[PDB]
Design a binder for this molecule. Structure first.
Ligand SMILES: [Mg+2]
Ligand SMILES: [Zn+2]
Ligand SMILES: [Zn+2]
Lengths: 122, 105, 119, 56, 147, 729
RNA sequence: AUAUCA
């Protein structure tokens, strides 16, 4: 109909073909239950390493580690939309989505011993 | 840089995650990089928040059809985007502030 | 019953008695989490069940052609339009009582002339 | 049968053949009589060998 | 039946009752485990009256509370007293039993033992439903009277 | 008045059209054709290509040369039937010459073969026709048979009888009929109470198998340990290649669903339902020992196999078992833990639902849960094992000919006699398997066609065998699909089923156009499911594979139904919506027995709920009946009539008579039988004609509605032994 | 071996 109203429309740059990380824009997802807070003095550092490939995420020692696994695909796909200072949007396709994928921990000096006790059970 | 390190999300940069239909993405690939690959535009309408996506005329010869977007919640999850460059440096680019699905039209 | 999980772990909660202040808690056996109990009831058996009777009553219940209709006037909207079925609790014992679901107000009324319900 | 409403304990639904053979059977009566009829043929068939071995 | 009482239908019923097997399970609506730390005062306001008496004219804070079916308690003729007596006589002096009166609206049996007690009571309720024989002879179910 | 309601005599005009098009052996022909046009190619392409690599000693020339040779199989060809006489000459062969000279009515199988060569030095692979493979017997009247496009006068010149209906093969001059074999449908979740003396009280079974490709007959059992009144009622599951039954929890953990409650969310969908949840507490306690994904896989890996000692080895195993042997339908791919976890959770939900006395134990005798393996799939089963027999004999040759560099001669490589005589054996003898060393093989699959009387021949091409709860009884689900009277007396009584006149058997279509359609029509994929967010979500399945959920099934179901009734979704595809259970199951699946029914719609401007087909269509058909443009297909695409299998039958409501069972009441003849009423306003379908519930033999019985049940069963056995003209030739 | 006969 007629537009008595105003719309703010931004130009979308359908994905720029040539980007430095054009190849990789990925999603790292954490479950809310994990309660990971990026703003942590502790979580100032973080390392992301391929485990030889699930990704391994670790803070300084004494902190939790997470494992990242890749989710299955579909017909639709996800794009990351970022906005420049100028309103224009640049979109980038998500290369892969990973669900992380960390530790607990409190899994040391156990597991193998608990199973054995369980066996001392039958 | 520091090898194996992750970069800077601390800046709290926000980004949007949008689900697009495969056919639309296919069309988008067509756009020339040289052009800057301007696929089309996003419209934000008031009188309630409505967001739609429309393809550029160049993309197809017809009347551009708007693709409505369904806004969705973050869900009980925190989504962050990390990028890996050719250099293989890893950076924590931003957090997903809003999620949306572009419906097919 | 209706039980909780540990925020932080999401792992289930095991009851612990606070011997000193004579009160019930819920501990997490994966982390150091503890929370006080909502109810004193920890375990409920239930041998003579009634939960299953009015199962799968989707508002689309009217769209099942296999379901039979009756001209019984509703207790709420007084509508003589309703679909009916028997206790969906697939047990031998079970009575042949009927459950009527209103094709307007959606209220579940029974034919039970021995007892009075709310489910 | 799919020709009936759910939770139908009526004679007509649970296999009561109302009609005489002289009058004829309705499709429903016909199929139910067929189910009941098949039961006897099964025991006639089985009994035959079970009964034989008992004799031996 | 015994020579004399051959036509006596009421005598038949008496034996029927004395022989047809009855378990605590057949009378129970549901069993519940509660944390009721004061043996003298109860968190369930319903039970408040049952304590007020089965006290006047040391033990576990964990309570096993089971509701019995009045209708079921009648067809297989039984009293709250006699049901309770079986439980009491099964677990001897290592279980403290109280029970709501046959008159009282809801039919209840409150049980308590004499660190770590949750699993202990779940065993006691299984023993109770599955192993406690009220009336009848073992292996003897559905007893019909016939003329 | 071309939109006037249809009478009872008009149902015959539709039946006339059904038979004008389909004929009496549509099942036999439609099956074979599907196998020749499609199935055959896919069998040549599953394993297909085979490679042999010759990597050197890397000493010095002539060493340090690494090679890899390829052999590929492309398009498959199939000639018209031919014969190779003693004096070399090959020429066409007609059915009559086959029967007289005791030949086989077979045609040639030809496949495009390609042989590539590659090489490297001491990582980079660099590159350095149509072959006969066997004679495949043709089923008469099929697409490939000469007699398919044959007119009446044509057949007579060919010394064939036009009344002959085809549906058999000609092997060494005797006619042979493949008998449909009845098996339980696979990829199907079923819950059963395990009897009074058992540790396990209930079991959830799934007979998982692939539509095509090796066919891993691994059946997953989800066991509820402990009986009704036993403490510590745990849930463990027996995994293929694993000796012990693993507690469900550890499986979810090994899958990646690590915390309890995240695990519980996959099993119980209602956070309110305390009853089911208490029942899961023991399992959580059982899996408490294992806390991460790794330790879960080790625990699975520990329990062999054999054991396969070494820590790195056992954890690597469990990965493979969960990927390749656990729930092989769905996917055998990698990153699909989310899909297989939600499925296991759907299985535990069903196991507990039955144990909580909310659902009934699965009817092992429901006809909807049974499949019929016809001539198509039977040949497909045989051809698979016969082609892998040839594939691995060519490899044995490629080794023999690369050792001596004897020039890989094609004729020496492929042994034609392998597939030719391999099929000829089965069809002849009847032991459906390889080969002159058969047992256990299933004898009587192929047999000599009864030619006593014409009816005897007809009823033999509609016969069903059931090998090995109460199978002999006539089930309600057998209505309109199988004849209630035509069954033998003695030993085979009720195990030999005979198809009703209007019964057909699903050929098997492609699931992807429907999976692609679904996602596009509001189907949220399982990979992103959050049970408590969308808790009333209708779970959607396509061939026992849970694909996702949908929020407004009402509208989706109508779209899918309109898709079928238009032709866009194939009419042989079964789709059912169980509202109460909140489920939408779809079947593209082969082997399902279906029957056609008239569609009834509330949809009528003028009055009540009325049968789509009107007196105008009826005359539109009888116009085409006088011509010998409006076929059976015409009624099918105009969505007037539909195909309904036993599973779908569960959700419909059928009227017996149209006219008698449509307009309500606004003296009565005493001689007529006592009839019921059209009380239903809900009617979705109407019966074309109730007499169609009967098979070929019972359909010659005059007034079978006036005879005692078995007297009819007797006649449909005797008429097979009655003399008459069997064929005019 | 299948089919069948009472
Ligand atoms: Mg005789
Ligand atoms: Zn915790
Ligand atoms: Zn109402």
């Amino acid at each position: 109909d007629e537009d008595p109203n105003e719309y703010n429309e931004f130009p979308l740059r359908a994905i720029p073909k040539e980007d430095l990380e054009n190849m990789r824009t990925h999603l790292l997802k954490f479950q809310s239950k994990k309660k990971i807070n990026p703003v942590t003095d502790f979580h100032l550092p973080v390392r992301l390493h391929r485990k030889d490939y699930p990704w391994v995420m670790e803070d300084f020692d004494g902190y939790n580690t997470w494992v990242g696994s890749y989710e299955a695909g579909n017909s639709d796909s996800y794009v990351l939309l970022s906005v420049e200072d100028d309103g224009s949007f640049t979109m980038i396709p998500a290369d892969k989505v990973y669900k992380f994928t960390a530790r607990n921990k409190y899994a040391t000096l156990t597991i193998d011993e608990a199973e054995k006790r369980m066996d001392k059970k039958s | 840089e520091e090898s194996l390190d992750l970069d800077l999300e601390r800046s709290n940069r926000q980004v949007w995650l949008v689900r697009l239909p495969m056919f639309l993405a296919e069309k988008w690939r067509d756009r020339n990089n040289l052009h800057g690959q301007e696929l089309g535009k996003i419209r934000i309408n008031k009188d309630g928040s409505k967001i739609t996506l429309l393809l550029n005329e160049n993309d197809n010869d017809s009347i551009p059809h708007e693709y409505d977007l369904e806004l969705t919640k973050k869900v009980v999850e925190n989504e962050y985007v990390f990028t890996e460059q050719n250099l293989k440096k890893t950076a924590i680019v931003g957090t997903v502030c809003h999620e949306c699905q572009v419906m097919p039209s | 019953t209706t039980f909780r999980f540990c925020r932080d772990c999401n792992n289930m909660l095991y009851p612990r008695e606070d011997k000193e202040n004579n009160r019930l808690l819920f501990e997490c056996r994966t982390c150091s989490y503890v929370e006080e109990a909502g109810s004193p009831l920890v375990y409920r058996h239930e041998l003579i069940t009634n939960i299953g009777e009015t199962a799968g009553v989707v508002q689309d219940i009217g769209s099942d052609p296999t379901l039979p209709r009756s001209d019984r006037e509703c207790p709420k909207c007084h509508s003589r339009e309703n679909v009916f079925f028997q206790s969906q609790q697939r047990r031998k014992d079970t009575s042949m009582v009927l459950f009527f679901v209103c094709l307007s107000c959606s209220h579940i009324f029974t034919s039970d002339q021995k007892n009075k319900r709310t489910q | 049968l799919p020709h009936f409403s759910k939770d139908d304990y009526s004679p007509e639904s649970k296999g009561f053949v109302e009609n005489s053979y002289l009058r004829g059977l309705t499709p429903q009566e016909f199929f139910f009589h067929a189910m009941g009829g098949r039961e006897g043929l099964i025991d006639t068939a089985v009994k035959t060998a079970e009964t034989g071995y008992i004799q031996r | 039946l015994e020579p004399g009482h051959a036509a006596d239908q009421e005598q038949a019923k008496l034996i029927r009752s004395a022989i047809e097997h009855t378990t605590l399970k057949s009378v129970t609506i549901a069993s519940e485990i509660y944390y009721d730390p004061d043996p003298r005062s109860t968190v369930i306001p319903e039970d408040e009256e049952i304590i007020q008496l089965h006290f006047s004219l040391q033990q576990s804070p964990w309570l096993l509370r089971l509701e019995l079916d009045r209708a079921a308690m009648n067809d297989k003729d039984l009293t709250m007293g006699q049901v309770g007596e079986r439980i009491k006589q099964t677990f001897k002096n290592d279980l403290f039993v109280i029970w709501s009166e046959d008159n009282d609206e809801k039919l209840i049996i409150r049980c308590r033992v004499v660190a770590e007690e949750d699993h202990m009571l779940k065993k006691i309720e299984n023993t109770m439903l599955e192993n406690i024989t009220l009336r009848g002879v073992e292996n003897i179910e559905r007893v019909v009277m016939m003329k | 008045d071309e939109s006037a309601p249809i009478t009872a005599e008009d149902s015959w005009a539709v039946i006339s059209a059904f038979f004008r098009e389909k004929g009496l052996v549509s099942q036999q022909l439609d099956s074979f054709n599907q196998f020749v046009d499609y199935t055959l190619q896919d069998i040549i392409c599953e394993d297909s290509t085979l490679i042999l690599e010759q990597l050197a000693q890397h000493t010095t020339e002539s060493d340090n040369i690494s090679r890899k040779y390829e052999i590929s199989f492309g398009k498959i060809y199939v000639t018209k039937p031919m014969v190779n006489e003693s004096d070399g000459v090959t020429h066409a062969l007609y059915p009559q010459e086959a029967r007289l000279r005791n030949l086989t009515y077979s045609s040639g199988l030809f496949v495009d073969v390609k042989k590539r060569t590659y090489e490297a030095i001491d990582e980079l692979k660099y590159e350095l026709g149509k072959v006969f493979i066997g004679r495949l017997p043709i089923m008469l009247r099929s697409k490939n048979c000469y007699l398919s496009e044959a007119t009446e006068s044509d057949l007579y010149k060919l010394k064939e009888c036009p009344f002959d209906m085809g549906g058999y093969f000609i092997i060494n001059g005797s006619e042979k009929v493949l008998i449909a074999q009845e098996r339980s449908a696979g990829n199907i979740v079923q819950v059963f109470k395990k009897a009074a003396p058992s540790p396990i009280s209930h079991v959830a079974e799934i007979r998982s198998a692939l539509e095509k490709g090796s066919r891993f007959i691994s059946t997953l059992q989800v066991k509820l340990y402990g009986r009704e009144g036993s403490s510590a009622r745990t849930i463990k599951a027996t995994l293929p290649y694993i000796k012990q039954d693993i507690p469900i929890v550890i499986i979810f953990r090994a899958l990646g669903i690590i915390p309890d409650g995240e695990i519980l969310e996959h099993i119980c969908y209602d956070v309110n339902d305390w009853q089911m949840l208490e029942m899961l507490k023991p399992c959580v306690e059982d899996g408490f020992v294992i806390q991460d994904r790794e330790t879960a896989l080790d625990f699975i890996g520990r329990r062999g196999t054999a054991l396969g000692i070494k820590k790195e080895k056992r954890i690597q195993y469990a990965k493979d078992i969960l990927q390749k042997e656990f729930l092989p339908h769905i996917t055998q791919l990698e990153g699909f833990e989310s899909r297989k976890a939600f499925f296991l959770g759907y299985m535990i939900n069903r196991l507990l639902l039955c144990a909580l006395d909310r659902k009934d134990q699965d009817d092992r005798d429901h006809f909807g849960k049974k499949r019929l393996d016809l001539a198509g799939p039977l040949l497909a089963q045989l051809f698979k094992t016969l082609f892998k027999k040839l594939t691995k004999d060519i490899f044995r040759y490629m080794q023999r000919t690369v050792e001596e560099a004897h020039d890989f001669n094609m004729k020496l490589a492929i042994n034609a006699k392998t597939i030719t005589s391999g099929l000829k054996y089965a069809l002849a003898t009847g032991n459906w398997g390889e080969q002159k060393k058969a047992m256990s093989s299933r004898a009587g699959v192929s047999q000599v066609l009864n030619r006593y009387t014409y009816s005897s021949t007809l009823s033999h091409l509609r016969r069903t065998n059931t090998p090995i709860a109460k199978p002999r009884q006539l089930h309600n689900t057998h209505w309109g699909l199988v004849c209630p009277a035509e069954t033998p007396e003695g030993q085979a009584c009720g195990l030999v089923k005979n198809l009703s006149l209007m019964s057909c058997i699903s050929v098997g279509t492609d699931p992807m156009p429907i999976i692609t359609f679904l996602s596009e029509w509001g189907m949220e994929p399982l990979e992103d499911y959050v049970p408590h967010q969308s808790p009333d979500a209708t779970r959607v399945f396509v061939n026992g594979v849970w694909h996702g959920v949908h929020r407004n099934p009402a509208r989706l179901m109508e779209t899918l139904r309109t898709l079928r009734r238009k032709g866009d979704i194939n009419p042989e595809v079964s789709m059912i919506r169980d509202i109460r259970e909140k489920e939408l199951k779809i079947f593209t699946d082969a082997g399902r027995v279906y029957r056609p029914l008239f569609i009834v719609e509330d949809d009528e401007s003028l009055g009540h709920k009325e049968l789509k087909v009107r007196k105008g269509h009826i005359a539109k058909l009888m116009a085409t009946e006088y011509q010998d443009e409006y076929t059976w297909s015409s009624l099918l695409n105009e969505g007037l009539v539909e195909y309904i299998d036993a599973e779908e039958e569960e959700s419909i409501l059928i009227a017996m008579q149209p006219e008698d069972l449509e307009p309500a009441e606004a003296d009565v003849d005493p001689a007529k039988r006592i009839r019921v009423s059209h009380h239903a306003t809900t009617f979705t379908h109407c019966e074309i004609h109730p007499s169609m519930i009967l098979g070929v033999a019972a359909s010659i019985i005059p007034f079978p509605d006036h005879n005692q049940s078995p007297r009819n069963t007797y006649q449909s056995a005797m008429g097979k032994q009655a003399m008459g003209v069997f064929l005019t030739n």
